Amino acid sequence: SGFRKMAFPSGKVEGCMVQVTCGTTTLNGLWLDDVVYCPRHVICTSEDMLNPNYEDLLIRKSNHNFLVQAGNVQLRVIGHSMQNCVLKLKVDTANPKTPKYKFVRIQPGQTFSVLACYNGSPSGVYQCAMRPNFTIKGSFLNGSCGSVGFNIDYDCVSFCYMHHMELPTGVHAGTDLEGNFYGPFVDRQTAQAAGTDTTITVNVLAWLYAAVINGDRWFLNRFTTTLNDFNLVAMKYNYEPLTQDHVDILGPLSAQTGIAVLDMCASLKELLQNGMNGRTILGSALLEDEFTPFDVVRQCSGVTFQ
Amino acid sequence: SGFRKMAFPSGKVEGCMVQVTCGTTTLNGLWLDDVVYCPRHVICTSEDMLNPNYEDLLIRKSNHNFLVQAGNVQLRVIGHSMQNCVLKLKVDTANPKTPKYKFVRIQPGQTFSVLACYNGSPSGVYQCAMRPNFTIKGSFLNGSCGSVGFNIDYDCVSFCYMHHMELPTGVHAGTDLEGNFYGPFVDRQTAQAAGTDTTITVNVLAWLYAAVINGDRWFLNRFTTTLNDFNLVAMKYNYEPLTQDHVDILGPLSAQTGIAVLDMCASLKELLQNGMNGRTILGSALLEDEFTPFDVVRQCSGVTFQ
Ligand SMILES: *[C@H](O)[C@H](C[C@@H]1CCNC1=O)NC(=O)[C@H](CC(=C)C)NC(=O)[C@@H](NC(=O)OCc1ccccc1)C(C)C
Numbered sequence: 292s293g294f295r296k297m298a299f300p301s302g303k304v305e306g307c308m309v310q311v312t313c314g315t316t317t318l319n320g321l322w323l324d325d326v327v328y329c330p331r332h333v334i335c336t337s338e339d340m341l342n343p344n345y346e347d348l349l350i351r352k353s354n355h356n357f358l359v360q361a362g363n364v365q366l367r368v369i370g371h372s373m374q375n376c377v378l379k380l381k382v383d384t385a386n387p388k389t390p391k392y393k394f395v396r397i398q399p400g401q402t403f404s405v406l407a408c409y410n411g412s413p414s415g416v417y418q419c420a421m422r423p424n425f426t427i428k429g430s431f432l433n434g435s436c437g438s439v440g441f442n443i444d445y446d447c448v449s450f451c452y453m454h455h456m457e458l459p460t461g462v463h464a465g466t467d468l469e470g471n472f473y474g475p476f477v478d479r480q481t482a483q484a485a486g487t488d489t490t491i492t493v494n495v496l497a498w499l500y501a502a503v504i505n506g507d508r509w510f511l512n513r514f515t516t517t518l519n520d521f522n523l524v525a526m527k528y529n530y531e532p533l534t535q536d537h538v539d540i541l542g543p544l545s546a547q548t549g550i551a552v553l554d555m556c557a558s559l560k561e562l563l564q565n566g567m568n569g570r571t572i573l574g575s576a577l578l579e580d581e582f583t584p585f586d587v588v589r590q591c592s593g594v595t596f597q
Numbered sequence: 598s599g600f601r602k603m604a605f606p607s608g609k610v611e612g613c614m615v616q617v618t619c620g621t622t623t624l625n626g627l628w629l630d631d632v633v634y635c636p637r638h639v640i641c642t643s644e645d646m647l648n649p650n651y652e653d654l655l656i657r658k659s660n661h662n663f664l665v666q667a668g669n670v671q672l673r674v675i676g677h678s679m680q681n682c683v684l685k686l687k688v689d690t691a692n693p694k695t696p697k698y699k700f701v702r703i704q705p706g707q708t709f710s711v712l713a714c715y716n717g718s719p720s721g722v723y724q725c726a727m728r729p730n731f732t733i734k735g736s737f738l739n740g741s742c743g744s745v746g747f748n749i750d751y752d753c754v755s756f757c758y759m760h761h762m763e764l765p766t767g768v769h770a771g772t773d774l775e776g777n778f779y780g781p782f783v784d785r786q787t788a789q790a791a792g793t794d795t796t797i798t799v800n801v802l803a804w805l806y807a808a809v810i811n812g813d814r815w816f817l818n819r820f821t822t823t824l825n826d827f828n829l830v831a832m833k834y835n836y837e838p839l840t841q842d843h844v845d846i847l848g849p850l851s852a853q854t855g856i857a858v859l860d861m862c863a864s865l866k867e868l869l870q871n872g873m874n875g876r877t878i879l880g881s882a883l884l885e886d887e888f889t890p891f892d893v894v895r896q897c898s899g900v901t902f903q
Pocket residue numbers: 318332340431432433434435436437455456457458459463477478479480481482483598
């Protein structure tokens with residue numbers, strides 16, 4: 292037993308990370324087959340950030356401007372193209388460590404692992420969620436751009452995020468691997484606003500089931516509620532609406548623990564209205580919302596990968 | 598910015614993980630050079646757990662009893678020996694993915710990354726700390742034994758933990774890689790007791806500095822304290838004593854933020870005596886103690902590895 296915020300093993304992604312340097316900007320790229328993917332703002336100097344024209348900057352670049360570097364070995368760039376907010380650098384060598392992969396776009400409320408990199412070298416791995424406002428609460432310092440987020444499903448890496456920028460509240464914004472931003476953000480350093488966030492209700496319920504599976508039961512009761520009456524409380528506490536689909540998705544956890552979904556909703560209502568009264572749940576004094584129902588099932592049945 | 602519980606990239610360890618099956622027990626092993634390391638209780642059936650004699654069981658075993666399996670490839674065991682609570686299986690093939698490594702034993706209060714594995718396949722990676730009572734609060738299901746904990750320092754993997762068992766409070770116990778248990782635990786399934794734990798004071802202070810670096814300042818004050826007066830409060834709240842060595846170790850973080858260590862102690866005193874009053878620090882409503890001063894510096898300066 293136990294419950295931890297657990298990332299996927301990162302080896303498959305480590306073998307794809309390279310360093311991309313152009314001008315005086317250095318950042319990370321993702322090397323799959325004979326293409327290196329990276330944030331297009333690499334073609335920008337410090338005076339460029341404030342109002343850039345990326346098509347302008349890119350026609351003025353040439354292949355030899357891009358210094359791509361895989362560990363020690365130099366990668367010769369033989370072509371370049373822009374796709375939305377990502378740059379695709381064609382190199383003359385296919386990455387022999389290329390995993391089975393897919394480019395997927397995730398939904399707010401879903402989780403993924405981030406491999407934080409600097410100068411093409413991995414620094415650390417952690418888990419997070421795409422927030423309802425399309426930001427992520429990451430840990431990124433300057434030079435981390437081009438680090439990616441991903442999920443793994445047996446042997447296949449589903450890349451879902453590439454890091455581009457930090458917003459004023461210290462949260463982070465980026466694109467899918469087709470270069471399309473998550474949320475209403477642009478890769479310019481003009482004033483931009485994260486937007487009001489909400490708590491991911493279905494994930495909080497999943498985590499309450501994780502707690503019951505692990506022996507925390509003090510928040511349980513036999514009050515029950517209707518879905519409509521629960522959603523009235525959700526709205527008041529800035530939680531998102533729970534749908535019948537969410538209830539269905541929680542079915543297996545409900546079946547495992549013998550606690551009906553609407554009964555767990557009544558527990559969450561009381562926790563919202565009363566607080567935790569100095570107690571903890573899975574070592575937290577807050578209601579945690581960055582574990583999906585899949586994350587709970589995965590961790591409490593021991594699914595593996597390779 | 599941001600602050601996450603961040604593990605080391607796990608690729609170097611993934612390439613060492615194998616499956617060890619003997620009798621009807623299956624667990625994980627660590628394949629370095631031509632040796633596979635695994636918990637010696639693999640030589641035990643279910644009736645053996647309750648009072649085993651491992652020297653008895655091991656002389657009755659032979660090499661062909663041990664089924665070692667690296668992904669798909671079969672590893673021929675050519676010798677076996679016991680070292681404390683670990684088994685060393687000599688195989689006829691050296692692991693070509695063997696990293697630079699060391700076997701280190703860590704101190705309570707130190708952190709490491711765990712690569713949780715089942716059937717020799719990595720499932721997830723997470724960070725934790727060795728508790729003052731020599732347990733770890735892990736996430737381990739049945740079949741996870743032989744999973745290892747580690748730190749990485751540039752290219753060198755320092756293995757510090759191998760998983761053996763779960764105690765009744767849902768915490769975990771294991772050995773260093775020389776097979777010596779952390780704490781007063783034995784690999785028998787007789788009743789065993791975790792022992793009263795304490796909070797790792799120096800780590801809490803490190804995390805408060807992480808918070809200031811990241812813009813949480815509401816808990817700061819200009820009350821100050823002496824080391825002796827702080828330790829009187831520590832003892833009352835079941836915190837461990839802060840030493841002058843701990844103060845010295847916090848020096849760089851103190852210098853970076855301009856907050857004297859003893860001033861941060863006065864903040865922690867007020868947090869202990871008053872609570873957090875509905876506020877959070879780095880997204881937690883509890884005082885977090887599983888980040889070392891090194892973990893904070895590493896994450897807030899961006900140190901990498903390969
Ligand atoms: C790429 O390595 C970095 C990563 C960034 C540095 C610190 N933490 C991070 O995640 N990305 C950038 O430097 C980008 C460049 C870009 C194309 C926008 N710039 C930023 O992240 C700045 N953010 C920003 O300009 O957001 C909009 C804004 C909001 C308020 C005032 C002005 C601009 C950030 C470094 C200030």
